[PDB]
Amino acid sequence: GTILIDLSPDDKEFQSVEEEMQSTVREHRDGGHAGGIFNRYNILKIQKVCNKKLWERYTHRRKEVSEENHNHANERMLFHGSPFVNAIIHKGFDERHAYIGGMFGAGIYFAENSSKSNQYVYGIGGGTGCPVHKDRSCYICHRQLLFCRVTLGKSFLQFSAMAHSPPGHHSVTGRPSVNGLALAEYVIYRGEQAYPEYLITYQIMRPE
């Protein structure tokens, strides 16, 4: 049921999604080990992910959460990187997409920093890198991230450097507590609380 609609680079929607991707790059404490060494991306394509059944699954859950949280879904647009991006856009997020060994438990993880999600494109810790060159810093191979609409509801705040949500909460927020430049990361425990709205194809760019 999924169709992918190409956005033109001239379209304001392409430009605003590109700007969120580029402006949320940061340096990582691994010196680039997992995701590569880069300061910016070459955006090759942005596609809108259109699936009516998956969208309605998302909005149904969104209304449930909103009604449990004084009419406030606490909806964000967050990045997701995963070896399973093809399955996610066709089947929806579910338990198979969870980070079993995540620091906040087995849930589905999202990032404000696009470069944090980029660390998971080829697997946990970047796996063995791109399939063609086995290079975690490959500048040649095409990568993909999702930019997703995510319902947080009442989020449990974890200060720090599938399972169930903490009771009375709909998600967990991992607040950066050491690295002052890090943006927040978030975990949901129900696949219905994210919709994979944009599929972004890109390369990391070698700094000059």
Ligand X SMILES: Nc1ccc(-c2nc3ccccc3c(=O)[nH]2)cc1
CA distances to 37, 83, 129, 173 from 54, rounded to whole Å, are 35, 20, 30, 24
Any known ligand binding at 148?
A: no
Q: How far is the CB of 104 from ligand X (least distance, A)?
A: 9
Interface residue with Zn ion among 133, 142, 164, 206 (CB under 5 A) is 133
Smaller CB separation from Zn ion, 66 or 203 = 203
Stretch that binds ligand X, among 15-23, 38-46, 78-86, 193-201 (CB under 6 A): 78-86
Name which of 143, 157, 18, 167 is nearest 83 in CA terms.
143
Which residue's beta carbon is nearest to the bound ligand X? Answer: 109
Q: Which amino acid is it at 135?
A: D
Q: Which residues precede chain breaks (C–N over 2.5 Å) in the chain? A: 161
Picked from ligand X, Zn ion, none, the partner binding residue 44 (CB below 5 to 8 A depending on kind) is: none
Quickly list DSSP for 72-118. ---EEEEEE--TTHHHHHHH---GGGSBTT-TT-SBEEEESSHHHHH
Helix (H, G, I), strand (E, B) or coil at 185: strand
Picked from ligand X, Zn ion, none, the partner binding residue 138 (CB below 5 to 8 A depending on kind) is: Zn ion
Picked from ligand X, Zn ion, none, the partner binding residue 130 (CB below 5 to 8 A depending on kind) is: Zn ion
By CB under 6 A, residue 185 contacts ligand X = yes
193: enclosing H helix or E strand: none
Interface residue with Zn ion among 54, 88, 111, 138 (CB under 5 A) is 138
Pairing of strands 143-151, 108-111: unpaired
Any known ligand binding at 141?
A: yes
Dist CA 74 CA 62 (whole Å): 9
By CB under 5 A, residue 134 contacts Zn ion = no
By CB under 5 A, residue 184 contacts Zn ion = no
Smaller CB separation from ligand X, 7 or 111 = 111
Picked from Zn ion, ligand X, none, the partner binding residue 109 (CB below 5 to 8 A depending on kind) is: ligand X
By CB under 6 A, residue 47 contacts ligand X = no
**Euclidean distance between the first and the last CA atom of the chain, given in angstroms as a whole number:** 43
Residue numbers at the binding site for ligand X (CB under 6 A): 79-82, 99, 109-111, 116-117, 120, 124, 185
